[PDB]
């Protein structure tokens, strides 16, 4: 497909068949097909989680700054007292995620092997590609076209970069993301990173 | 009926034996003699745990304390045992230990003198008076039920031991009562992370 | 009473040896034969002092009980009895082990 | 706190040692004229000593009875920065160097006479190889999983 850096030949192993292909691999990680498949799945999951994380730490801050719901900040959301102790929630999350991730791992190892429901035997997932289960996971029945996959990959990459920026710019400056953006917009030439220290 | 869908079964475990679900990640049973010995030992362990669990559970439901406290009297000098609330005249450490050693050694040696590989696990005859083992159709089902119940009993005994280690001087029943008192604060979480 | 304990322990050990563990001991001693050097027994190699005392082990008991078995089981019983006596003599208290 | 050790801000021998060092420096400082460069150098030395002692007090080390700081390599969470973090950094750097060297050796093994390439290094190939060490743990893990790490 496209070239990430003009004037540079794309790597031979990247043929453009994969969605979201731009030939960006200067360090030679995906020189083996098995590594390519594993890293494709890893890039899907890391980024499918990142989009949700970025939305969760972005939208409530905006809606609170508007003045509709008062919500604690994403860094201070752990100190608040909830209906249950953090340990019980962690244990429940650990068990459920153990189950679902072991199911996904068994799907990755042997494709089309864990499609069948273990309890109600009459229900099974339709056959498809790895990483896109479909079926019940696609309740609205949207076609898994290549353009949609490219859009999803681009959005995931942007979300990963945004999460990294959130973490770094909250570590350096004690304020949150939206207030940092507002402060920068107040005076663009005297509020950048180089102005600080 | 595998222990994990999509995981290939080992060659030596095909599913003919009762309770055969193809679980052997470490491959400890490749040698047939080792497999036979492991089967016999597993059956013995399952039967022992199945007999032991009600013995732990029936006390602490009545006025008596628990399984751990019932062993305390031997540590104190001149201690005497009790049963159902009545002291036993012949309750003292040396005589009790001697009788237990003699009887258990005799019965274990008599069990071990058997030569037939099948009889070492399912002897039959004078050990089953009711006669449920005559019909071959129900024998496999009964063996499967026994194996599953024995595995559950072993897991229960491990749970009992770990619960006692977590809460010294505490019984399983009072642990269940404490958990039922407030299910959202008294869990394994506060012990896992301190 | 030392006599009662000694007699009880010795009798129980002799009864256990004669009636219970006789076959196991015979089978195990048959499995591991005489010590051998370079594939031959110590007497076959040329050592006259390593000759088995066949006459001593012969006995008229129906099952084959001989003097050596009596000595071994009596020694075990006496060791057990004197351990019991010595341990019961003193007043050591573990105090919650 | 640990093994009968005293926090370095509390201990008195630390301040005594600082006093001895400052007095020893001032003894030589008194000789030269105030405007002379040696006086400025000695004043800078005194300031450096004071800053070093202040930083050592701040970082929370534990001096012993003799008044010198001690290092804890147990793994206690209060003293992870003394040993564990520099250890991780050193392991990362050493793995980088080893991976780069092994990659260059494997790359030049193909030619007919690798000895002339070893005695006379080629710069473009080494420059291309060097920057691949930034991701050495992932590559090593994947090669171990595949089975290309160990020769047969
Ligand atoms: C991806 C994972 C994710 C996770 C782990 C969390 C985690 C959390 N959310 Mg967020 N959130 C997310 C995505 C996520 N959110 C998304 C996609 C949205 C939609 C914009 C929100 C919008 C949101 C709201 C509106 C609120 C939370 C709140 C909370 C907290 C309470 C948890 C709960 O009650 O259930 C917890 C810190 C609650 C809170 O009290 O925040 C401190 C709350 O009021 N979240
Ligand atoms: C908006 C970005 C985005 C986009 C374009 C896609 C696109 C796609 N997804 Mg992915 N996906 C995403 C994010 C995204 N996904 C996230 C965050 C998760 C984790 C929950 C997943 C998990 C996932 C699964 C489990 C599956 C797919 C599948 C699909 C395909 C069909 C469904 C569809 O057309 O979606 C188009 C989506 C939209 C038009 C987005 C609308 C806006 C939503 C409602 C936002 C709500 C968020 C807000 C902050 C609250 C398509 C390639 C299915 C498939 O491939 O089956 C064959 C399938 O099996 N996706
Ligand atoms: C993904 C896009 C992205 C965007 C739009 C922003 C946007 C913003 N950043 Mg963040 N940031 C990001 C990612 C991003 N950041 C990443 C990846 C890092 C880690 C290197 C940081 C670390 C960071 C710091 C340390 C600071 C900001 C600050 C700011 C603001 C000033 C911009 C600036 O000075 O240049 C900073 C630009 C970068 C560090 C790299 C370019 C960003 C991406 C890669 C470009 C495409 C602005 C609102 C400043 C702030 O707090 O304002 C008050 C500030 O001090 N950012
Ligand atoms: C220690 C007692 C014990 C023993 C000897 C066995 C023995 C055996 N099991 Mg059973 N099993 C047990 C307890 C035991 N089990 C428990 C508690 C469970 C519930 C988790 C099961 C559940 C189970 C399943 C699901 C299956 C078996 C099967 C087997 C057979 C083949 C595997 C093997 O070679 O294991 C040899 C095992 C040992 C020598 C013990 C190793 C213990 C190590 C040293 C300690 C590790 C510590 C521990 C994890 C804490 C063999 C007869 C397989 C079968 O087909 O049976 C015919 C099979 O599919 N077992
Ligand atoms: C599997 C082996 C097993 C073993 C070794 C023990 C061992 C013991 N039991 Mg338990 N028990 C078991 C299973 C077992 N039990 C089962 C299956 C049940 C249900 C019927 C019980 C019900 C039970 C009760 C109701 C009591 C014990 C008590 C005792 C203790 C005193 C022994 C005694 O005085 O007997 C001497 C009596 C005889 C009749 C001699 C023959 C001793 C720790 C006693 C205790 O709790 O101590 C305070 C007691 O009161 N047990
Ligand atoms: C055999 C089934 C079994 C059952 C029904 C129970 C039941 C109980 N456990 Mg025990 N436990 C078991 C085995 C079991 N345990 C084993 C094997 C271990 C060793 C890891 C423990 C170690 C343990 C600890 C450390 C604690 C409990 C406690 C409790 C209680 C609360 C559960 C909880 O909050 O988190 C406990 C969570 C787990 C250990 C999961 C258990 C599920 C089993 C092991 C899975 C297989 C079960 C079967 C197939 C269904 C509950 C009455 C808690 C308590 O006493 O609170 C007052 C607590 O502190 N358990
Ligand atoms: C070497 C051979 C040897 C033999 C044949 C015996 C034989 C005997 N000893 Mg022993 N004894 C031995 C070594 C030996 N002792 C040594 C080396 C010591 C020194 C530690 C002792 C110390 C000793 C004591 C202090 C006592 C005996 C007693 C006895 C008699 C009890 C009978 C019995 O054992 O059960 C036969 C009965 C059954 C019911 C079966 C019996 C005559 C006890 C005795 O005199 O009993 C009356 C007695 O009090 N023995
Ligand atoms: C090219 C990189 C290289 C690598 C990856 C290894 C790898 C190894 N060495 Mg070898 N070694 C090397 C060079 C290298 N060596 C050189 C140059 C010498 C001569 C000084 C030795 C002499 C040597 C000895 C005497 C021993 C090892 C041992 C070991 C093993 C354990 C690690 C260790 O103890 O380090 C020990 C490391 C050193 C003594 C010095 C090596 C570091 C040098 C200075 C740098 C190598 C970098 C190289 C110049 C990079 C050029 C590439 C560039 C042009 C792109 C391990 C297989 C040990 C063993 O046998 O374990 C089983 C051991 O006993 N090595
Ligand atoms: C998953 C992820 C973030 C997940 C965030 C989550 C779950 C957040 C959860 C919460 O916020 C909520 C919702 C609400 C809060 O109350 C609580 C918390 C818990 C805080 C980020 C991934 C972030 C991932 C990132 C940034 C990855 C970057 C990778 C890069 C740049 C790689 C580059 C290269 O590899 C290439 C592509 C090719 C090679 O040739 C060259 C090199 C250079 C090696
Ligand atoms: C005749 C007869 C009979 C009988 C028999 C008998 C009765 C026998 C006995 C026997 C015996 C009865 C024996 C014994 C033995 C013993 C021994 C052998 C011992 C030993 C010992 C020891 C060795 C010791 C040691 C010591 C010391 C010295 C010191 C201290 C310490 C001790 C203790 C260690 C009958 C009827 C049956 C039958 C018929 C015939
Ligand atoms: C310092 C610690 C160790 C101390 C060891 C002391 C050992 C003292 C041994 C003294 C002698 C023992 O008794 C000795 O036994 C041997 C058998 O074993 C007898 O027999 C020996 O001589 C006869 C006659 O020539 C030979 O046929 C025979 O092969 C030989 O072994 C001896 O005739 C006898 O005298």
UniProtKB/Swiss-Prot annotation, chain A:
Chlorophyll a 4 binds at residue 155. It is a multi-pass membrane protein. Induction: Induced by low light (LL) but repressed by high light (HL). Inhibited by cold. One of its GO terms (biological process) is photosynthesis, light harvesting in photosystem I. It is found in: Plastid, Chloroplast thylakoid membrane. The keyword Transcription does not apply. The chain crosses the membrane at residues 49-69, 82-102. Keywords: Chlorophyll, Chloroplast, Chromophore, Magnesium, Membrane, Metal-binding, Phosphoprotein, Photosynthesis, Photosystem I, Plastid, Thylakoid, Transit peptide, Transmembrane, Transmembrane helix. Photoregulated by reversible phosphorylation of its threonine residues. Binds at least 14 chlorophylls (8 Chl-a and 6 Chl-b) and carotenoids such as lutein and neoxanthin. It comes from the Eukaryota. Chlorophyll a 3 binds at residue 152. Chlorophyll a 1 binds at residues 24, 43, 157. Chlorophyll a 6 binds at residue 184. Chlorophyll a 5 binds at residues 151, 169. Chlorophyll b 2 binds at residues 48, 91. Its main location: plastid. Chlorophyll b 1 binds at residue 4. Belongs to the light-harvesting chlorophyll a/b-binding (LHC) protein family. The N-terminus of the protein extends into the stroma where it is involved with adhesion of granal membranes and post-translational modifications; both are believed to mediate the distribution of excitation energy between photosystems I and II. The LHC complex consists of chlorophyll a-b binding proteins. Red-emitting heterodimer with LHCA1. The light-harvesting complex (LHC) functions as a light receptor, it captures and delivers excitation energy to photosystems with which it is closely associated. This is Chlorophyll a-b binding protein 4, chloroplastic.
From Swiss-Prot, chain B:
One of its GO terms (cellular component) is chloroplast envelope. One of its GO terms (biological process) is response to low light intensity stimulus. Its main location: plastid. Chlorophyll b 3 binds at residue 108. Chlorophyll b 4 binds at residue 111. The chain crosses the membrane at residues 48-68, 87-107, 152-172. Chlorophyll a 2 binds at residue 45. Chlorophyll b 2 binds at residues 47, 88. Induction: Induced by low light (LL) but repressed by high light (HL). Inhibited by cold. Keywords: Chlorophyll, Chloroplast, Chromophore, Magnesium, Membrane, Metal-binding, Phosphoprotein, Photosynthesis, Photosystem I, Plastid, Thylakoid, Transit peptide, Transmembrane, Transmembrane helix. Chlorophyll a 1 binds at residues 23, 42, 151. Disulfide bonds: none annotated. One of its GO terms (molecular function) is protein domain specific binding. It comes from the Eukaryota. Chlorophyll a 4 binds at residue 149. Light emission at 684 nm upon excitation at 410 and 470 nm. The LHC complex consists of chlorophyll a-b binding proteins. Red-emitting heterodimer with LHCA4. Interacts with LHCA5. The N-terminus of the protein extends into the stroma where it is involved with adhesion of granal membranes and post-translational modifications; both are believed to mediate the distribution of excitation energy between photosystems I and II. This is Chlorophyll a-b binding protein 6, chloroplastic. The gene is LHCA1. The chain holds residues 46 to 239 of 241 of the full protein.
UniProtKB/Swiss-Prot annotation, chain C:
Keywords: Chloroplast, Membrane, Photosynthesis, Photosystem I, Plastid, Transit peptide, Transmembrane, Transmembrane helix. It is found in: Plastid, Chloroplast membrane. The chain crosses the membrane at residues 4-24, 67-87. GO terms for biological process: photosynthesis; photosynthetic electron transport in photosystem I; photosynthetic NADP+ reduction; photosystem I stabilization; protein stabilization. It is a multi-pass membrane protein. GO terms for cellular component: chloroplast; chloroplast envelope; chloroplast membrane; chloroplast photosystem I; chloroplast thylakoid; chloroplast thylakoid membrane; nucleus; thylakoid. The keyword Transmembrane helix applies. Not yet known. Belongs to the PsaG/PsaK family. This is Photosystem I reaction center subunit V, chloroplastic. It comes from Arabidopsis thaliana (Mouse-ear cress).
Swiss-Prot record, chain D:
GO terms for biological process: photosynthesis. It is found in: Plastid, Chloroplast thylakoid membrane. One of its GO terms (molecular function) is mRNA binding. It is a single-pass membrane protein. Its main location: plastid. Keywords: Chloroplast, Membrane, Photosynthesis, Photosystem I, Plastid, Thylakoid, Transit peptide, Transmembrane, Transmembrane helix. Plants lacking PSAF have altered thylakoid structure and are not viable. This is Photosystem I reaction center subunit III, chloroplastic.
